[PDB]
Write a protein that binds this ligand. Sequence first.
Ligand SMILES: Nc1nc2c(ncn2[C@@H]2O[C@H](COP(=O)(O)OP(=O)(O)O)[C@@H](O)[C@H]2O)c(=O)[nH]1
Ligand code: BEF
Ligand SMILES: [Mg+2]
Lengths: 442, 166, 365, 349
Amino acid sequence: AKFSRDFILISEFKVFGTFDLNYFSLRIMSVDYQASFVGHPPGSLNFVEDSKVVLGDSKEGAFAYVHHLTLYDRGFVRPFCMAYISADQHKIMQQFQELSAEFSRASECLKTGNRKAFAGELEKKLKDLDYTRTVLHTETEIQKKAYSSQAIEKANELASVEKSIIEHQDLLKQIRTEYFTQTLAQLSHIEHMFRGDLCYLLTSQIDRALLKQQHITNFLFEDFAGQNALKFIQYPFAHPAIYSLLSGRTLVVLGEDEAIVRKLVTALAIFVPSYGCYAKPVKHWASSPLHIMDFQKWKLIGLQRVAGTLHALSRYSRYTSILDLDNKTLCPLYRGTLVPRLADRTQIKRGSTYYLHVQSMLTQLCSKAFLYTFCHHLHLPTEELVASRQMSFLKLTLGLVNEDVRVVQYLAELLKLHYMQESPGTSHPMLRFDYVPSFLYK
Amino acid sequence: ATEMRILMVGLDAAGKTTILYKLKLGEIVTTIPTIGFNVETVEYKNISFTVWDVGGQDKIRPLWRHYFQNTQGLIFVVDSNDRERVNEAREELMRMLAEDELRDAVLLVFANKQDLPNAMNAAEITDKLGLHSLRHRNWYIQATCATSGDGLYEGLDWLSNQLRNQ
Amino acid sequence: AKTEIALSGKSPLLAATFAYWDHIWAPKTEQVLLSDGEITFLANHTLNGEILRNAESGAIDVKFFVLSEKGVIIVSLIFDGNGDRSTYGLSIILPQTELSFYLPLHRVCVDRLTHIIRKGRIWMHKIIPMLTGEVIPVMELLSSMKSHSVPEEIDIADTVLNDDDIGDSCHEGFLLNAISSHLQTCGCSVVVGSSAEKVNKIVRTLCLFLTPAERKCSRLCEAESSFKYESGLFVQGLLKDSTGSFVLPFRQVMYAPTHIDVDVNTVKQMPPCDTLVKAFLDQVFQLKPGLSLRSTFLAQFLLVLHRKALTLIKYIEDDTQKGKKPFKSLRNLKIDLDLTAEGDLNIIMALAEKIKPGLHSFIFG
Amino acid sequence: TQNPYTELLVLKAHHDIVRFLVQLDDYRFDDGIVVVWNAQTGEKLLELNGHTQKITAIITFPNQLILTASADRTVIVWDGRQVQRISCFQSTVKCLTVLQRLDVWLSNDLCVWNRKLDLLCKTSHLSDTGISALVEIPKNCVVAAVGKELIIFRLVAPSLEWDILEVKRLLDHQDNILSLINVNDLSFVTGSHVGELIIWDALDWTMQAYERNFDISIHHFTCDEENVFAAVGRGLYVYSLQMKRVIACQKTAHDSNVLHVARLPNRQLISCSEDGSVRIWELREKLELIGDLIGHSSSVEMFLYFEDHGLVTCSADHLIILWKNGERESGLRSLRLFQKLEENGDLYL
Ligand SMILES: Nc1nc2c(ncn2[C@@H]2O[C@H](COP(=O)(O)OP(=O)(O)O)[C@@H](O)[C@H]2O)c(=O)[nH]1
Ligand code: BEF
Ligand SMILES: [Mg+2]
């Protein structure tokens, strides 16, 4: 009860692309019954002709671009249909505008191509016919100088045919495997991004339409995986790690067992706010006695226990929070409301389901940061009064709780540094910090 | 009193479309092999002859049955130059005349395209058409050429003379 | 056989006609580009192609031709059915240059024609009065939108936004309730207004919350003609006559898959088809809208709505094997989706239907 | 925990630990590489590199471009651009100071040269060891200490030729000299390498103090018209000036040996230690911890203070840190975006 996703036929007296001649075309859709059905009058140097088909038992038709191929040999007939088909009716109608252009370019490739190839056949043919005419006008002409009336009649017929060929060749110049390879490649490309349902395709265009307007606030999580990440939310007392990651404090992950370190260093990289043109300021598998500059533009790093270093790294305890894996030891005491909803005892299944949850709930904070950074009745005008109003604005308008506020102005600093420099901490190191105490959890 | 539906059929590359063009305008134009059908009619001797050009493709050979209604005259054209697939053509003819759906309609075998001396007078052509073999049928054949454009007229005259009695 | 008729405004339609087997309608204008016989020649191709009468009981098999040989778009819905059980259906013609205009309107044109044919077949059993009676409204709806309706790229120049004023007690409640009702009515509602500039302003304002393609699925207001409650458009502006009664058929409106008045200022969703929006309403006024900084924050709320809707669809579609079992999951669905308010849940659900229809039934309908 | 300086900019452009930081102008200030920076932005504007061995001093002559000397027994005059000139007499000098009122400047021997970089006068072979210090004195006098012997080589103003005669000598100290500063026009402080603290009278040139009830290698002493503060090893000890005793002491100071101390203008005293930790201190009614600044793995030489910008603190781990106030820095960042968007137009245009 299925249907193919490409076809091509020329009915007189074929071809695939679903999965490079996929074998699964289950026995409810005949290979050439629809080819017989699409055989229709339409088309009578010509030009393009789009169409649509009707339902049946039980697959709806789709874009059936019909275009003549070239001059074969009946003089120029070449009924080449680059038919497409799908089992979702409304999808073709809704996406017709986008679907048309790709097939149009594909067919224009064949037109700018195989027309040239007929080209050569015509050329040679006349060349061969002209050679025959030269042989006639030399040898047969000498023989006449030496019945011959029939030879002259044949020569006249050949000259007329040669004139016809010359005129046809001159006309075919006109604007109107060297090329077939990229045409099949482009057909495969057309098949490529439409595999999904229309439900996802509509969003894939609506979101792309929206994001070209939020040019300023998009640099945080524009992104230019879950199951392990979900398990990190089987690991108890992991909540403050998210806050440390969000607030700008470096979260050093230190331990042996390369595999687990690489499992977590990329799983937790979704939560890292960006800096600028650089993709992500994440360091993979750092190995050194470390320096302060190393903490500047590497937002988080991973070290290894060469069987300690807790006293060696505990001197820099005001700038980073330390995570140790095997001992399950690991941030300020945090009683918030923002991140607990970002990661709960959730009954969510599947990996990518949680990724979209995070991606949706993250942009809300981006909008909040935009508001805080670009309200004029706050930054514009005593230090005591301005601090009081800034601290009280978030208690009422944005509805935040206690220490959760800290991340907001951090992100805001990112935005304002972006607006002018576009390079916060890459060539002009900032390295913001605080004097909050800490605590250790077993 | 003026209607005449004709199921004009034929084999591939038979120029039956050129026959229809001769009947309509009497002029030769290049023809792309027709895909579905054409609808034209000619009025002659106070009766309008309605002729539908069809396709003779082997894939659509088991498709003419969908045109097997409302036609009284089963005019069929067989090539004479192509001394091949004549048995296949005969089998197709007997299979399209054996069903009671077309039993009401009256048969009219016909030929064309004398052309080169390879195909000659209709004795053996009609023999391979087996005119004497059929039972409960009628047949009357002329030799016609499109270039000269002569012969179709007497075919129409015979159609009229032998069918106006109903 | 053409019966030339005229209507106010420029003519988008180029023709419209019928079909037989052994064009009476035309947009009367000046210097038609293609002759009368051309309509017939075009009509034969679209008509003389059925042959294979593979129909069980009867349905509208909508076709669509973009036939660039002459530059004409053809739409038809052929059905079987008098004297003989033949097949025949209407047809509609548009010119090539008016290509993008029809595409958003296909889903309403097909429904209108289907209802028209369903009426005609009723009178066929037990011929041309109905044919001409229900051919002008179809040619009126599409002709009206030629130079009206809100385009996609609308600024905040004539919006309720860009006001520098939050409004009184009644204004805030009216605005918040209007936006809540719109978002909870799947985005299909028309505005009634006594005045002209007020209705146009509020309609253009409320149209900012829709997709760009959806914008062409609208109807601007005017005080000249007499429009009708076309039950296929999303946002429609109109003017009410001094009689005191709106022309709103009950059957046409109810069959759709709200009422907002500029004068009395009370929104009511009498025919059927929250804190997230409250926050947006309360905060958007606290910024300076002169320098466009208030425009950008508009997009964020809609984006957060779309993504929160898509995640609910995915969470519903993976809790069962693309549909193989009862859902029986409400508390868990509400808790983890960061939406405990019933209004917020309904708002999130509303954006889902625009992508995946039938989900309301599938979940709890 | 109160305390200023919430932001920490980091600079890295040097190959060796540079122990000298000298003010240059309003906005601008051992491998022989001279680099200057912008206090606000942090951009390494321009660069100077002409030395071979380690540099020995850096000063300014208000013009007021640069004046640096190294271990190559030659003094060069850089500006910025194009170098002015270079001076090489015989040996290498470890001290240099400019006399403002006399409008002259001077360098095993002492040589004073005019603004034309020409040695106007020069003494004979003073001693086998170099000049440990050079402190300006009232009445066009120059005071220097050579290890265990300190001689006030006075300079006679210019028939208009400059002259220089030493007018006094002392032997009270039993060790080498560490540092000496001129506390206003009051007196001259003397310190012994063994840790003995002494004073020198301005015009009387008479010793008037000796404190020894404290490794005792007191390095730097910071003082003003109020009281004398000095550091020795692992304890910060304040010796009273007027009342002439020890006013304030703090035994539990930084665990390493202090290197340089100074007093902030708004009444606090900061400390630099060998351990790399710099802590601020506030004077009380007879002191307490003010804050902590953990900045490097190794020591820090000296700190330079800016009125409205912050501090410069690094010499060891080949770095430079410009500590800032933060909060006050954010406000200046805010008032430059709002005042720019109005002139620009909309957000994106
Ligand atoms: N020489 C010659 N050619 C013929 C004759 N009748 C038909 N043809 C050819 O038939 C061709 C057209 O065939 P076509 O219309 O495509 O197929 P059909 O309609 O099924 O017969 C033309 O190119 C003619 O040359 C004839 O009597 N003589
Ligand atoms: F000319 Be076709 F064979 F109908
Ligand atoms: Mg033919």
